[PDB]
């Protein structure tokens, strides 16, 4: 090598017969639970090519779809996954540039997920290979919008909140009484039993909110006085739940439930329980009003 430096002869072989797809999941809430789901990507011949002896419509792959997989256990990680398209068995009859389009499938839509609509044009450069004496898929380039870039897709995972509030009314109502509550979140295919969600309890006064966790499929016990609340801060979208207060009729309280999703139909319920609610992308506020009079 020259002076201090050393001369290296090898070079890394980038497989010109495989294309890497990178999938990222952007989180609206950094503490979001990660759903058990696949994301699927498709490659097809680009139909819009002006064919000469230079540019060609892509030759269809034996396996045009590839996928990545997410699970609950990915929570806390990079949430970056990769998959490959395999061109190694594709027969290219002559040298040339073979055109494909790569898209992200959106058929079995995962609740709370906004899908990347990006479409990539993919050029497979098939060159005559001197040593092998045949046309060989030698390098692959992809582009969206006039920058040559890696094939990357970024879906967004949204999630929501549930706030439960206690209000005491009536001249006989005890503003210092603790009312008992239970919250049960139900498992589904996307979020399994025993997964944890974060809960913050707010009390009147100087104390900062108190953090606890609830387990999916396990009754969560809590108490609230007038003017206090809990908030499930990372409730996933698509999760069923029930909130119930203990019965206080023998203590001369009447209980009514207000169910109020942010942009939705506010619901009023005589009694001490919500019906089974299903979480949406809208923040939910549920107020228990307990009233006592003379």
Written description of the protein model:
The chain folds into 2 domains: 16-158, Immunoglobulin-like, CATH 2.60.40; 159-294, Sandwich (Immunoglobulin-like). Strands 2, 3, 4, 6, 8, 9 and 10 form a 7-stranded mixed β-sheet that branches. The protein starts with 17 loop residues before the first strand and ends with a strand. It is built from no helices and 22 strands. It is mostly beta strands and 294 residues long.
Helix content: under 10%
Sheet with the most strands, sense and barrel status: 7 strands, mixed
**Overall domain count:** 2
How many extended strands?
22
What overall form do the CA principal axes indicate? Answer: elongated
Order of helices and strands: EEEEEEEEEEEEEEEEEEEEEE
CATH-level-2 architecture of the largest domain: Sandwich
PDB class: structural protein
Keywords: All-beta, pili, cell adhesion, structural protein, isopeptide, Cell wall, Fimbrium, Isopeptide bond, Membrane, Peptidoglycan-anchor, Secreted
Assembly: monomeric
Entry title: Crystal Structure of the Major Pilin from Streptococcus pyogenes E117A mutant
List the helices and strands and how they pair.
Blueprint: E1 18-27, E2 37-45, E3 55-57, E4 65-70, E5 80-86, E6 96-104, E7 113-114, E8 119-129, E9 134-144, E10 147-148, E11 151-157, E12 159-169, E13 179-185, E14 196-202, E15 210-215, E16 220-224, E17 229-236, E18 240-245, E19 254-261, E20 267-270, E21 277-278, E22 284-291
Parallel strand pairs: 1-11, 3-6, 12-22
Antiparallel strand pairs: 1-5, 2-4, 2-6, 6-8, 7-11, 8-9, 9-10, 12-17, 13-16, 13-18, 14-15, 14-17, 18-21, 19-20, 19-22
């Amino acid at each position: 090598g020259p002076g201090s430096a050393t001369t290296v002869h090898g070079e890394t072989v980038v497989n010109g017969a495989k294309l890497t797809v990178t999938k990222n999941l952007d989180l609206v809430n950094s503490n979001a639970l990660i759903p058990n789901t696949d994301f699927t990507f498709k490659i097809e011949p680009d139909t819009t090519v002006n064919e000469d002896g230079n540019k060609f419509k892509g030759v269809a792959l034996n396996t045009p779809m590839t996928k990545v997989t997410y699970t609950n256990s990915d929570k806390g990680g990079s949430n970056t996954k990769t998959a490959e398209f395999d061109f190694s068995e594709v027969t290219f009859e002559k040298p040339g540039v073979y055109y494909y389009k790569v898209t992200a499938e959106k058929i079995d839509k995962v609740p709370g997920v906004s899908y990347d609509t990006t479409s990539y044009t993919v050029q497979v450069h098939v060159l005559w290979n001197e040593e092998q004496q045949k046309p060989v898929a030698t390098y692959i380039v992809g582009y969206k919008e006039g920058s040559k870039v890696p094939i990357q897709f970024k879906n967004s995972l949204d999630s929501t909140t549930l706030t439960v509030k206690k209000k005491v009314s009536g001249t006989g109502g005890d503003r210092s009484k603790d009312f008992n509550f239970g919250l049960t979140l139900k498992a589904n295919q996307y979020y399994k039993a025993s997964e944890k969600v974060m809960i913050e309890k707010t009390t009147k006064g100087g104390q900062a909110p108190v953090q606890t966790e609830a387990s999916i499929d396990q009754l969560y016990h809590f108490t609230l006085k007038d003017g206090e609340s809990i908030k499930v801060t990372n409730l996933p979208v698509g999760v069923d739940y029930v909130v119930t207060e203990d019965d206080y009729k023998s203590e001369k309280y009447t209980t009514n439930v207000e169910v109020s999703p942010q942009d939705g139909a506010v619901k009023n319920i005589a009694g001490n329980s919500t019906e089974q609610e299903t979480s949406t992308d809208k923040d939910m506020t549920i107020t228990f009003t307990n009233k006592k009079v003379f």
